[PDB]
């Protein structure tokens, strides 16, 4: 059949639905279509424009001469409105508010879960997807994430910064994690500035492949982390270790190379493909009041650079510091530690102080005196500073909601006698240096396009304190990572298109789906995050758990020295603190179709606002959670459980807006009997049905599927094992599998993750020395269990043939003669097995006739002989058929028996047993032969610490 899709000529199968073919060639959204069921018209998202009108493509059959537009303005508007309607009834958080509070948007929930498991290297690996200096951030970050935490609404926010510091220091100490560098892209990037923004840009451009050169004026890398942040907050050995981890990736460092003196920007552009300007704000703002030239007017950044460099610093007994930033606080505490009575004067109130609040409280403990709402007007003295004239200030008018401006109170002028005045009122980059290189700046801050971070010159990007003025290390790292993303987009030619996509993705959907880079950048920088408005009443059911307190150094002792005031947490408190997380994020955030469609179609949550259906979560089942607040009502779970599994776990209840999915009224999911309850977790498209995971904290991780088989029975059903850095998270169902669905035994009992650790001799575990002694002493007839792959069976058989050891298997009989086609076509079947012990027979035999006479195929349980009709002989071992094929049946006669695998019915055997472990099924590779004669491949989820081949030598 010839159909025309968006002007092109296409040939499609007549019987198959149009949505399948369209999704093959382009992108079509839609929740409710599964080919195993008939077309269902519930989601209303697969709309196409036909000559007759706008219709759903899941119901259409390809006809001759049919012309379909898949992306027109009206279709975009209709899909957008449908998504907004769905989101208007959706309740839940895609990510936790901790991730939205972080300027770099780090997966706080995921690495807190990894810390609760004890996997600190993996937690740091997850941290380094969004920033580069987790130890520095654990020491100095103002903890924007802990301000937004949902634990603020119950007792106290999680100690995210301190747990991050502990894990980062563990990684630095017990071997640092270094990333994988992709093959070289042939491009070179000039980075100017050795501060955190330049380091972040270099690190994330190196992790993409480009060769990076860092230019820095100072002799060492670190910027204001090394020359402005004092060593009682950030020890420089920690900074050296962190910067070493960044620089060891392959970054070419050129320190003592300045811009404007050694190399000009035009030469940098001509030699390098793109240039990032992260020179930072290294000039201090003057106050402009008369007498500022008097001796004793030091600037805070220069003073702190002299103290950090060890240069001789002259300081009087009385010191006044002007400002309220982090610069002022570090100046105040450094001057206190040098021996001066320090007063800090700020023009605003204490609440609006930009400084880190923990540092302000620490300074108040140490003896720093504050006077807020005060402003210096004059500095009085002959040649040196003797006194400073201060005016008291009051908050002004709210103006255009500009948080008011301080207006002086006339007549409140007072004089304070001081010796040194330190200026920390702000920072900027040299305006004349910016005119020398030709970058458009206002007030000394470089003007860049807010999306692309690009200056007025092509190939020049900027960030850090150069763009944001006095800012944070994490905000600088965020600007650096975004600039690395934008530089990688500029080096491919996609930057203008990417900026258009980031402004409004609903107009460039075809380009978003057509380009991998645009899709990745859109989902990295502008993802759809769903929010709920939660007050303190919504967390009253939560157990009140206290927050860990880390014993700071004594204020009296720490006011005299430059020793670090805050230590790292003890390892016993780390797990206790990490287990206070409430896991606010959605467990299906990395696979939810609704979130993806809302990202692509620019859907707003507040487009339609009204009443939502409020449901209670049904988490009584040991393994499955049902959340009707995240139910888009597609009917796929109902269709499966009623038309394929025949179990009827859930069904549609009530009518209209009140419709929801659930068991019979008065029962929860715990009372429901069915061996295919866990298939609903893979059936659900959004995350209303989720699986409880056997980990301490289940925090959603970006797991990668691995294609293998199940070892629960002779069926050997194909499945995906979801792995995240040696963690066997869950088993899911493949679409391309011969079975399609897996049972609750595989999912919830996990026979693929089960292994006996050590050999068992006469019912007691023994070491491998005793096993080797038993193997050397006795005859040790070789008994194979059906938990071995075909290649292992061949190896063991050849070893037995070479050495002459008698070889056998616990399984006896003959293999099956039926294929899946025979069971699929036959209508009268002979069932001489228990249906519950082989759960896939429930799906395979739907609607067949279970007879005792006149049958067409026979289903019998081994050991057995094939019958006249095509027979299905089912054993309890996955590779029982492989054992039968290779001809190792029967139990041979000998004195003592070495059995490879802890299989049942070995107690029937006569003599003494040596049960050798066969290993983890998930760590095995090869092929198996299942009941229907298929040769199915097994793959490794992680590296194998045990192999039966080397054990026998």
């Amino acid at each position: 059949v010839k159909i025309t899709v968006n002007g092109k000529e296409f040939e499609a199968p007549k019987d198959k639905s149009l949505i399948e073919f369209l999704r093959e060639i382009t992108h079509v959204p839609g929740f409710c279509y599964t080919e195993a069921f008939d077309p269902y018209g519930s989601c209303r998202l697969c709309l196409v424009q036909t000559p007759r009108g706008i219709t759903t493509s899941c119901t259409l059959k390809p006809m001759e001469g049919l012309s379909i537009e898949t992306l027109s303005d009206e279709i975009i508007e209709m899909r957008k409105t449908a998504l907004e309607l769905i989101l208007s009834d959706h309740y839940g958080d895609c990510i936790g508010p901790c991730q939205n509070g972080c300027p770099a948007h780090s997966d706080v929930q995921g690495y807190l879960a990894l810390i609760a498991m004890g996997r600190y290297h993996e937690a740091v690996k997850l941290m380094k997807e969004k920033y580069i200096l987790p130890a520095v951030l654990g020491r100095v970050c103002p903890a924007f994430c802990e301000e937004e935490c949902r634990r603020n609404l119950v007792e106290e926010p999680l100690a995210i910064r301190q747990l991050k510091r502990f894990a980062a220091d563990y990684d630095l100490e017990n071997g640092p994690w270094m990333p994988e560098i992709p093959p070289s892209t042939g491009k070179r990037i000039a980075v100017v500035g050795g501060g955190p923004a330049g380091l972040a840009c270099a690190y994330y451009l190196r992790t993409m492949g480009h060769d990076v050169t860092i230019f820095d004026a100072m002799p060492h890398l670190g910027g204001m982390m090394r020359y402005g942040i004092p060593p009682y907050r950030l020890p420089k050995d920690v900074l050296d270790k962190d910067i070493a981890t960044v620089i060891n990736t392959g970054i070419e460092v050129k320190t003592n190379t300045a811009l404007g003196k050694d190399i000009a920007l035009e030469e940098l552009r001509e030699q390098y493909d793109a240039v990032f300007l992260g020179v930072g704000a290294w000039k201090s703002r003057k106050m402009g009041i008369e007498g500022e030239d008097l001796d004793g007017v030091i600037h805070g950044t220069e003073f702190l650079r002299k103290v950090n460099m060890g240069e001789k610093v002259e300081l009087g007994k009385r010191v006044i510091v002007v400002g309220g930033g982090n610069t002022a606080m570090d100046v105040a505490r450094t001057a206190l530690r040098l021996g001066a009575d320090v007063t800090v004067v700020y023009r605003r109130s204490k609440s609006e102080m930009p400084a880190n609040s923990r540092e302000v409280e620490e300074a108040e403990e140490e003896g720093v005196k504050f006077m807020f709402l005060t402003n210096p007007v004059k500095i009085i003295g002959k040649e040196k500073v003797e006194e400073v004239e201060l005016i008291k200030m009051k908050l002004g008018e709210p103006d255009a909601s500009g948080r008011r401006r301080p207006m002086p109170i006339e007549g409140s002028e007072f004089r304070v006698k001081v010796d040194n005045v330190i200026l920390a009122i702000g920072q900027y980059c040299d305006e004349e240096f910016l005119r020398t290189i030709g970058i458009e700046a206002k007030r000394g801050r470089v003007l860049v396009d807010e999306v692309t971070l690009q200056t007025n010159k092509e190939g020049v990007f900027a960030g850090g304190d150069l763009v944001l003025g006095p800012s944070t290390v994490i905000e600088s790292i965020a600007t650096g990572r975004r600039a690395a993303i934008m530089i990688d987009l500029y080096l491919k030619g996609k930057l203008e298109k990417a900026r258009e996509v980031l402004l409004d993705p609903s107009k460039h959907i075809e380009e978003v789906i057509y380009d991998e880079d645009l899709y990745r950048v859109l989902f990295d920088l502008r993802p759809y995050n769903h929010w709920k408005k939660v007050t303190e009443k919504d967390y009253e059911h939560v157990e009140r758990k206290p927050r860990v307190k880390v014993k700071l150094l004594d204020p009296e002792i720490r006011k005299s020295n430059f020793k670090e005031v805050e230590p790292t947490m003890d390892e016993e408190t780390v797990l206790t603190e990490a287990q206070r997380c409430m896991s606010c994020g959605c467990m299906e955030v990395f696979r939810c179709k609704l979130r993806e469609y809302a990202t692509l179609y620019d859907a707003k949550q507040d487009a339609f606002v009204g009443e939502q259906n409020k449901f209670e979560i049904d988490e009584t089942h040991p393994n499955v959670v049902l959340d009707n607040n995240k139910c888009v009502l597609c009917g796929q779970c109902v269709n499966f459980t009623h038309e394929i599994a025949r179990e009827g776990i859930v069904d549609y209840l009530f009518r209209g807006f009140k419709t929801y999915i659930g068991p019979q009224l008065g029962e929860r999911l715990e009372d429901q009997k069915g061996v295919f309850i866990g298939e609903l977790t893979d059936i659900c498209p959004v995350g209303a049905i989720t699986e409880k995971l056997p980990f301490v904290k289940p925090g959603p991780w970006k797991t990668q599927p691995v294609k293998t088989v199940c070892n629960g029975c002779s069926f050997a059903c194909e499945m995906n094992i979801e792995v995240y850095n040696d963690i066997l998270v869950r088993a899911s169902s493949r679409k391309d599998s011969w079975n399609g669905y897996i049972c609750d035994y595989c999912r919830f009992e996990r026979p693929w993750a089960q292994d006996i650790a050590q050999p068992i001799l006469k019912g007691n575990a023994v070491s491998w020395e005793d096993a080797e002694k038993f193997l050397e002493e006795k005859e040790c007839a070789l008994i194979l269990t059906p938990s071995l792959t075909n290649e292992e069976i061949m190896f063991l058989k050849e070893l037995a043939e070479r050495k002459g050891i008698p070889i056998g298997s616990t399984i006896d009989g003959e293999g099956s003669t039926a294929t899946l086609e025979d069971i699929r076509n036959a209508k009268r079947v002979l069932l001489k097995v228990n249906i519950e012990k082989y759960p896939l027979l429930k799906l395979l035999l739907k609607g067949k006739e279970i007879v005792e006479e006149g049958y067409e195929v026979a289903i019998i349980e081994g050991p057995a002989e094939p019958m006249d009709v095509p027979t299905l002989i089912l054993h309890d071992g996955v590779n029982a058929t492989g054992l039968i094929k290779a001809g190792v049946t029967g139990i041979p006669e000998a004195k003592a028996y070495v059995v490879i695998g802890n299989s049942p019915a070995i107690s029937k055997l006569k003599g003494e047993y040596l049960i050798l472990p066969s290993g983890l099924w998930a760590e095995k590779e090869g092929t198996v032969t299942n009941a229907f004669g298929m040769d199915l491949k097994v793959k490794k989820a992680r590296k194998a610490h045990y192999d039966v081949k080397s054990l026998f030598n």
């Binding site: 018209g41 989601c43 209303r44 419709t659």
Partner: protein, 589 residues
């Protein structure tokens, strides 16, 4: 000599007091030792003049209106014994000239009416098949048994008969699709699931003349090849179910239903399926799912009911009115049916005049009659002489047609053009005291209740549209709410899966199209019809008040010469029981 006395015993008659009148007539006949036949009849159509008592002479029928039990002794004494009609109470006369019944009425109700479906209602006893036989019934069944089934299909498709329950698909094409479908077992369904809140015509046919529907179903089953027929009527209509069961028993015992029907070798059985009650179950696919024991959730159309319907077998689902039209076409010919109505829409339509119309009831009008004729000559206009603002045609599925478009003929396409549909056949008349925003809100409220909650567009968009309408009605709206309605309603129409959601935005769309000034007045906090509770303030006129205080003992909230605005329940009982011009509903501003 008075042969019979008939009392109208439909649901409309029963609600008015026809049982009391019938028993009073029986008592008066027993007391006077008279020997007249007391029979029940259906509804002629004058529902405003009920209870109706018919005195049937051999040549004339004299129908009295508003026959209460206490009027019965006077009527009996003066008419059935003395022989003098009481001309004050006579509302209808029927006489026979050349075998065609001619009608005279007080109000001119029947002048513009051509009764094809309701030709026997109100004259025959619905529970006696002998009376229906004597009225020419079941002669069309014998005639259709004479001819071949495909000839019946050609007769039906050449008459221009279109579906009376919905969009108006040609009935002969539907029958042909069911007959041409491959299969040995086929079913027919009579759709009596009138979910329209203002429609009563289908139960009117099923109560006043069920044998017409039975005969039409048998003719259609012979034409298609169906073995089993289903009458899908709601359990909320018990009188219709009772009369259908009586009629089925009488038709079975006389050989019209069963095995070897009238020597045609044709076996047909009719079984009454009682619907549980849902507006969505009137949809074809939801009706099929409801008969099969599932939820009434519609499914996509490319599998059509005429090819894969009830338990997979082909099904023909037609309305009660279409099945009732079939015997008239077989008896009188397809050319006689094509001699009525417009070019595209042939025949007659049964409408239900309700609301603020004076002569409300069941009307049988030919296609192409203008709406103004129905509203003013047949309906008589409003009940208080006020002007008619609009009409709601098609129930919740249709839309409001305003008074400057009353020249539109009632055919399918002329009504489809204006943004309404013929729909069930419901015609609700709105006057100057009706808020169009309130009407749209009521229809969207009904749609929100009756949605099956399967597709996202209907389930969610109808709730969002109703919330916007409630926001506008409470006065808390703005222009952005109206723009949201204007954007959302076409998308709910275009995107929904079944006809309930595809006709759900029709009232909102039509009210915005014709009555946007009322919407913009509600944005400013005022109801031009003084209907919305928060936008009206009940003010007392002191200069026109009286010390009698008629509207002071009837108020149950105790907010009364002075009105306690902070305690007024806003019921409105003051404005009626005052029996004086002192209470004035005024804008709260």
């Amino acid at each position: 000599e008075i042969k019979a006395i008939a009392v109208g015993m439909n649901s409309c008659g029963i609600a008015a007091g026809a049982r009391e009148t019938y028993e009073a007539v029986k008592e008066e006949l027993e007391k006077r030792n008279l020997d007249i036949k007391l029979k029940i009849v259906g509804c002629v159509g004058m529902c405003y003049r009920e209870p109706l008592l018919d005195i049937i002479t051999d040549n004339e029928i004299i129908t009295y209106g508003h026959v209460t039990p206490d009027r019965v002794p006077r009527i009996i004494e003066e008419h059935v014994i003395n022989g003098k009609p009481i001309e004050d109470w006579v509302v209808k006369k029927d006489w026979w000239e050349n075998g065609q019944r001619k009608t005279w009425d007080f109000d001119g109700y029947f002048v513009k009416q051509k009764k094809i479906v309701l030709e026997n209602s109100g004259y025959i006893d619905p529970e006696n098949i002998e009376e229906y036989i004597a009225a020419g019934g079941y002669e069309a069944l014998k005639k259709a048994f004479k001819m071949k089934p495909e000839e019946i299909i050609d007769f039906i498709t050449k008459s221009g008969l279109r579906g009376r329950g919905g969009a108006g698909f040609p009935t002969g094409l539907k029958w042909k699709f069911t007959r041409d479908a491959p299969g040995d077992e086929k079913y027919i369904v009579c759709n009596a699931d009138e979910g329209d809140p203002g429609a009563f015509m289908d139960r009117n046919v099923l109560e006043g003349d069920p044998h017409r529907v039975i005969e039409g179903m048998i003719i259609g089953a012979y034409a298609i090849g169906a073995t089993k027929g289903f009458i899908y009527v709601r359990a909320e209509y018990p009188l219709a179910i009772k009369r259908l069961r009586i009629a089925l028993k009488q038709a079975r015992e006389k050989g019209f239903l069963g095995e070897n029907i009238l020597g045609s070798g044709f076996s047909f059985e009719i079984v009454i399926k009682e619907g549980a009650g849902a507006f969505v179950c009137g949809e074809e696919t939801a009706l099929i799912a409801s008969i099969e024991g599932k939820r009434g959730m519609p499914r996509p159309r490319p599998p059509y009911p005429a090819q894969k319907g009830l338990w997979g077998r082909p099904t023909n689902i037609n309305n009660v009115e279409t099945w009732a039209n079939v015997p008239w076409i077989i008896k009188h010919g397809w050319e006689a049916y094509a001699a009525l109505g417009t070019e595209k829409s042939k025949g007659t339509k049964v409408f239900a005049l309700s609301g603020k119309i004076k002569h409300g009831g069941n009307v049988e009008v030919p296609m192409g009659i203008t709406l103004r004729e129905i509203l003013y000559e047949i309906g008589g206009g409003t009940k208080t002489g006020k002007k008619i603002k609009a009409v709601q045609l098609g129930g919740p599925s249709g839309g409001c047609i305003p008074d400057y478009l009353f020249n539109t003929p009632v055919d399918y396409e002329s009504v489809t053009a204006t943004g309404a549909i013929m729909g069930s056949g419901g015609m609700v008349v709105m006057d100057e005291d009706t808020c169009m925003v309130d009407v749209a809100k009521f229809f969207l409220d009904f749609t929100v209740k009756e949605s099956c909650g399967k597709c996202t567009f209907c389930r969610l968009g109808t709730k969002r549209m109703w919330e916007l309408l409630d926001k506008i009605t409470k006065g808390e709206g703005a222009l952005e709410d109206i723009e949201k309605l204007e954007k959302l309603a076409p998308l709910v129409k275009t995107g929904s899966l079944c006809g309930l959601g595809q006709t759900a935005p029709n009232p909102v769309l039509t009210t915005l199209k014709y009555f946007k000034d009322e919407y913009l007045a509600h944005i400013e906090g005022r109801c031009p019809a003084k209907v919305c509770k928060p936008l009206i303030k009940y003010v007392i006129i002191t200069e026109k008040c009286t010390g009698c205080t008629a509207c002071a003992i009837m108020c149950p909230v105790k907010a009364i010469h002075l009105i306690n605005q902070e305690a007024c329940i806003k019921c409105g009982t003051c404005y009626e029981v005052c029996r004086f011009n002192a209470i004035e509903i005024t804008d709260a501003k």
